[PDB]
Design a protein around this nucleic acid. Structure first.
Ligand SMILES: [Mg+2]
Lengths: 500, 37, 98, 35, 97
DNA sequence: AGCATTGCTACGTCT
DNA sequence: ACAACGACATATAATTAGTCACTGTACACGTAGAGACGTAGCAATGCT
DNA sequence: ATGTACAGTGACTAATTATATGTCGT
DNA sequence: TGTACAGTGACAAATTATCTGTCGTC
């Protein structure tokens, strides 16, 4: 086994230079006579020089240097007390308990009093014995992970199956983060931090879309992100963007955090209707392609904005609610500009050759089909195992409904699709030849002068029934129209359909 | 070294001057927001 | 700052004074940490002094009841904390200085 | 040095007998814990 | 040397770096040196200055400022000593104990 | 007669 | 031959174990839990 | 003039004891 | 083979402070 000498000292150089001065060969009878100069040079007898030669000719520079002692790192308290210390500390720190070396020393002293030990380990002896344990568990805390390199990648799934990522749109990802920005309503009281949910192309490391809003992580949020991700992009001249967010088209997979909206029925309906397969993430680390852009985006954007809230409670800067000043119609513009004019053109961290954008456009397997917008708005939420009435009429969530073509059918199991943001109308479906086929569009009885949303109609049904009101669509509609979420929802009302 | 100098030269080729516009206009916006009081 | 307490003070015969800031409270803020270190940390279900520091299984390990924790805390105060030296004085245990 | 040595040597005479026996009794209690 | 600890970027850039970091860390804004250097790049381009400072200089400029902002966390309090004691009421009256 | 569907309430369970 | 590795007993000195006076640092109400979406309890309002 | 005060630290020092030395040895 | 950006070590390029000559009368 190779061992190399290190930390060659001055005294080792003195000892080495005389050794080198006797490495020069000569006859052994003068050899044993010229080495006599070492005697006063080292202040020791030639018998030590003979020993030094025996070391150096045996061991080289390593044995020419002095070793550590045989007792280095050996504790003279003996195996009982060194066992006792490491036993006591490790059992005292199991689970949530967090004993400390000072607490251990009290145990040592206690046991010694029981043992009548005349001289138990001092606290600093107990502290010394644990220093290897503390250090070894410290190094185990911070081990770097290599990360993937080059074009080849595969993503582990909670199924256990590992799924290769082969071309752009092969595997999208999403998760939600709570934005670190307090931002405010019109004129502006503090409201609260929004959520950000992002679609990330695992091949290009590109980012095809986001939903930003106060809405909690929900299937309507994920659906509205995909509605953004999948469509062609057009942003108004009021953004004054330099770059166009040309990423569109549809995934072959959607790989995601296992959040309850990602595990929802509604999204699975989208999976069937758009052809992607939902795959679950095994552990958070496998998500890193989307976990990390929150770190990247926090650092490069949110930390510079007035309402910044810090990375943790323990770092929370106290001015955040004192001068939060953006509204979401500005934070949208900030985030959208950051993505489209910077992040899209930023270099992909392990390719170097090209931007994030060009690894999308050059990496997709072929040019995807740009779908009609109305088709995703036919990919609405659906309800099933309901029944059509034996007439021209329908029901949903205590609303009551009419339909143009339903009268041709007796009462039978029906499927229906609805916009939760415009429950004024429903699209109705029938199981013809074991296939979903359109029945008709439908409307609430007499409802045309105004439009209704699902969330407010659900809330109205609570105050409707508890007051003992006669249950009907007529009375339910009044309890819709007769606040934190009101401010939040009326901020989200600001939308590009009025602006494009 | 010469292989790694390809990555370095490729990354340094970015036409970044059109990318700076985000940073100055983001700050200009935040400075345009005066506090409510 | 309740009327109730100020009325107890008027009845029992002491004035109620408020500290400027918690630093001035250090005489009372500190025994918590001497409890936190020397007692609560060594007990099943220690929750850690911070969100960044809660043990990964505090809720799994949680088993002490209110009567049990009090029965320990009283042993700590009577047999230990009040028998320690006053840290200004060195000579006198906290009870002998009382 | 003398002031410290008197201050130190005073602290050394205090018996930990109560302050010590409570330590093993706390663990002997907690030894009954199971989740 | 008389030059040790003194930069060669000069008085304009020494100020502009430190000006930009200082405004970026009031309120809850937490602008780190890299974002300052990215401002310096933008500033030189719009100034038509062909030689913006490198991020290593910007980090070295702020290193003493960062350390002064750090030291404030550590400053110890002497505490009361001996027998004599009082407590600081918000009335402003030191009640002897 | 028969249930049969429709609109709430857990009790998790996950981020 | 006598310069090669032993046989010491005794220094030599580099290990550990222990004493102390210093000092950093958390004690300052605070994450158990909001907020989604099932599988499964239910009632009800229908009706044949 | 003075927040609090305990656990962990450093800078030695007393005791251990691993092993270098000087002489003889064959 | 998680992700990957801001900060940092070791070094070269450039600047420039100042210290080393050969010197002159003191
Ligand atoms: Mg998530």
């Amino acid at each position: 086994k190779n061992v190399i000498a290190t930390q060659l000292s001055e005294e080792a150089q003195v000892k080495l230079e005389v050794i080198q001065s006797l490495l020069e060969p000569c006859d052994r009878t003068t050899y044993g006579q010229k080495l006599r100069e070492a005697a006063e040079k080292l202040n020791v007898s030639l018998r030590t020089v003979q020993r030094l030669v025996k070391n150096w000719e045996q061991d080289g520079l390593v044995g020419l240097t002095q070793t550590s002692r045989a007792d280095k790192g050996k504790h003279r308290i003996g195996e009982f007390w060194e066992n006792f210390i490491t036993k006591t500390y490790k059992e005292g720190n199991k689970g949530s308990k967090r004993m400390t070396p000072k607490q251990v020393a009290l145990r040592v002293e206690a046991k010694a009093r029981e043992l009548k030990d005349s001289k138990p380990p001092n606290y600093k002896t107990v502290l010394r014995v644990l220093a290897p344990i503390l250090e070894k568990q410290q190094k185990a805390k911070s081990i770097r992970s290599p990360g993937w390199r080059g074009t080849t990648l595969s993503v582990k799934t909670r199924e256990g199956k590992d799924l290769s990522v082969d071309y752009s749109n092969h595997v999208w990802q999403c998760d939600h983060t709570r934005v670190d920005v307090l931002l405010v309503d019109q004129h502006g009281e503090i409201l609260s931090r929004p959520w950000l949910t992002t679609v990330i192309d695992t091949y290009s490391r590109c980012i095809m879309g986001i939903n930003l809003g106060f809405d909690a992580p929900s299937s309507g949020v994920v659906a509205l992100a995909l509605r953004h991700a999948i469509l062609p992009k057009r942003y108004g001249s009021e953004y004054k963007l330099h770059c166009e967010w040309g990423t569109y088209g549809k995934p072959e997979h959607f790989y995601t955090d296992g959040g309850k909206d990602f595990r929802s029925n509604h999204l699975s309906q989208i999976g069937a209707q758009l052809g992607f397969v939902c795959h679950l993430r095994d552990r958070p680390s496998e998500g890193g392609v989307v976990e990390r852009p929150f770190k990247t985006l926090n650092d490069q954007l949110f930390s510079t904005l007035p309402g910044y809230t810090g990375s943790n409670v323990q770092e929370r800067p106290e001015d955040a609610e004192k001068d939060a000043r953006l509204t979401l119609r500005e934070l949208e513009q900030l985030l959208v500009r950051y993505i489209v004019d910077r992040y899209n053109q930023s270099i992909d961290a392990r390719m170097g050759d090209q931007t994030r954008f060009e690894r999308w456009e050059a990496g997709l397997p072929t040019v995807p089909v740009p779908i009609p917008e109305r088709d995703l708005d036919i990919c609405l939420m659906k309800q099933s195992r309901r029944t059509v009435q034996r007439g021209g009429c329908l029901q949903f969530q205590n609303l009551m409904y009419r339909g143009e073509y339903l009268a041709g059918y007796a009462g039978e199991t029906v499927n229906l699709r609805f916009d939760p943001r415009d429950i004024t109308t429903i699209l109705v479906y029938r199981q013809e030849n074991n296939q979903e086929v359109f029945l008709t569009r439908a409307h609430a009885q007499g409802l045309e002068t105004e439009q209704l949303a699902l969330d407010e109609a659900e809330a109205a049904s609570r105050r409707l029934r508890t007051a003992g009101k006669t249950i009907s669509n007529q009375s339910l509609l009044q309890e819709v129209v007769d606040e934190r979420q009101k401010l939040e929802q009326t901020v989200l009302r600001s939308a590009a359909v009025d602006e494009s | 070294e010469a292989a790694s100098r390809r990555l370095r030269t490729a990354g340094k080729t970015i036409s970044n001057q059109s990318l700076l516009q985000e940073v100055v206009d983001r700050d200009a916006l935040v400075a345009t927001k005066k506090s409510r009081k």
